[PDB]
Amino acid sequence: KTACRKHELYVSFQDLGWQDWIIAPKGYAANYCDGECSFPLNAHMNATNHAIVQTLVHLMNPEYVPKPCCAPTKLNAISVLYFDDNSNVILKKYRNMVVRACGCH
Amino acid sequence: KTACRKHELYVSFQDLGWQDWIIAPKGYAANYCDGECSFPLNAHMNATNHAIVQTLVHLMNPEYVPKPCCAPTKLNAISVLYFDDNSNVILKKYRNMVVRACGCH
């Protein structure tokens, strides 16, 4: 299907200009949400009641209200081992870094 | 502005054709999220780390990765009084029905 789902995406820490201070990892799978949001929609799974109402209001007025959009429903963190200038090896956990599941909101 | 924000939107149950089972209310302010998600990211859009990274990665390879999507960050519930198939009068609380705030996730 071409519906709202999680897509794999690898991001190199070079994009953020962290490389010169990171030990590991040199990158990670950030992934991203993407896909069309339309019926079928489940308020207890990959959607909210509002998304159901909006999708409906959209079908009868595409020129005004847009379809809900594919966004993350579950995000994981990633730990990074890096050093500062005093040579301190540090371990920092970054939350909401990885997309695990997507849904319509 | 063209930035991600909450747009006012009243929904009438008659327009949806639901004016048969739903007794009260006759409609309610559903609102919806719309707008572009890109820098600058206003603090109110409570953008996650993942959205920040995606916005950046998108800006480097738009043909590849898309912009985060504008979606609700805070929603309210509404109670509705309706008749079911067996003519029973039910009062059901519907969560995630009213959009209060929008952000980039």
Curated annotation (Swiss-Prot), chains A, B:
Annotated glycosylation sites: 46
Main localization, broad class: secreted
Subcellular location: Secreted
Keywords: Chondrogenesis, Cleavage on pair of basic residues, Cytokine, Developmental protein, Differentiation, Disease variant, Disulfide bond, Glycoprotein, Growth factor, Osteogenesis, Secreted, Signal
Entry GO CC: enzyme activator complex; extracellular space; vesicle
Any one Gene Ontology BP term: response to retinoic acid
GO molecular function, one term: BMP receptor binding
Protein modification: Glycosylated at Asn-46. Glycosylation is crucial for recognition by the activin receptor type I/ACVR1.
Keyword Glycoprotein tagged: yes
Disulphide bonds in the chain: 4-70, 33-102, 37-104
Keyword Glycoprotein attached: yes
Family assignment from sequence similarity: Belongs to the TGF-beta family.
Annotated disease: Iron overload: A disorder of iron homeostasis with incomplete and age-dependent penetrance. It is characterized by adult onset of increased hepatic and systemic iron levels, increased serum ferritin, normal or high transferrin saturation, and inappropriately low or normal levels of hepcidin. The severity of the phenotype depends on age, sex, as well as additional genetic or acquired factors including alcohol consumption and increased body weight.
Subunit structure comment from the entry: Interacts with SOSTDC1. Interacts (when glycosylated) with type I receptor ACVR1; the interaction may induce HAMP expression. Interacts with type II receptor ACVR2B. Interacts with Hemojuvelin/HJV. Interacts with ERFE; the interaction inhibits BMP-induced transcription of HAMP. Interacts with BMPR1A/ALK3. Forms heterodimers with BMP2 in vitro; the heterodimer then binds to its receptor BMPR1A /ALK3 and may induce HAMP expression.
Function, in words: Growth factor of the TGF-beta superfamily that plays essential roles in many developmental processes including cartilage and bone formation. Also plays an important role in the regulation of HAMP/hepcidin expression and iron metabolism by acting as a ligand for hemojuvelin/HJV. Also acts to promote expression of HAMP, potentially via the interaction with its receptor BMPR1A/ALK3. Initiates the canonical BMP signaling cascade by associating with type I receptor ACVR1 and type II receptor ACVR2B.
Name used for this protein in its record: Bone morphogenetic protein 6
Phylogenetic classification of the source organism: Eukaryota, Metazoa, Chordata, Craniata, Vertebrata
